[PDB]
């Protein structure tokens, strides 16, 4: 169940309300200000990292279940989502529908959105690819 949720469900959830659009209307006060601006933020693919922990000083390093148990740390990994930021503007003429046009401002990056706890012995856990010898090295019971 957990493997299905991480691999597929996470992307599906983000691809429902990925689009948030704010419209700034013409605000007719003078003829020199008659443009209507549209700001768009969209969410694309999501990336999940391996389990990790960030210390107080800000150093981030790979975390293993053995260390997490002793240090009272949560065995979790970070989630990154590609964000497409677009803005459209159009000339608002009274009594007519607008024709929004791209204003040559389309930012192309990964944004941290939180940490997802990782179930042990899952596809995203360090122990899935560990053999019996590897588990003994990592102080984990086979």
């Amino acid at each position: 169940s957990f493997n299905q949720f991480v691999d597929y469900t996470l992307q599906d959830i983000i691809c429902e309300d990925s689009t948030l659009i704010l419209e700034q209307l013409a605000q007719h006060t003078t003829e020199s200000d008659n443009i209507s601006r549209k700001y768009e933020i969209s969410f694309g693919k999501i990336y999940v990292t391996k389990p990790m922990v960030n210390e107080s000083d800000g150093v981030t390093h790979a975390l293993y279940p053995q260390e997490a148990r002793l240090r009272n740390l949560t065995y979790s990994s970070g989630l990154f989502v590609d964000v497409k930021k677009r803005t459209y503007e159009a000339i608002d003429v009274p009594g007519r529908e607008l024709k929004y046009e791209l204003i040559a401002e389309e930012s192309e990056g990964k944004v941290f959105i939180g940490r997802l706890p990782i179930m042990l012995r899952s596809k995203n856990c360090y122990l899935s690819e560990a053999t019996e010898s590897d588990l003994y090295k990592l102080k984990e019971c086979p």
Binding site: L20, I21, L22, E23, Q24, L25, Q27
Partner: peptide, 9 residues
């Protein structure tokens, strides 16, 4: 005047 800020679905 309008609210000068609205959300379009």
């Amino acid at each position: 005047l309008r609210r000068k800020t609205r959300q379009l679905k």
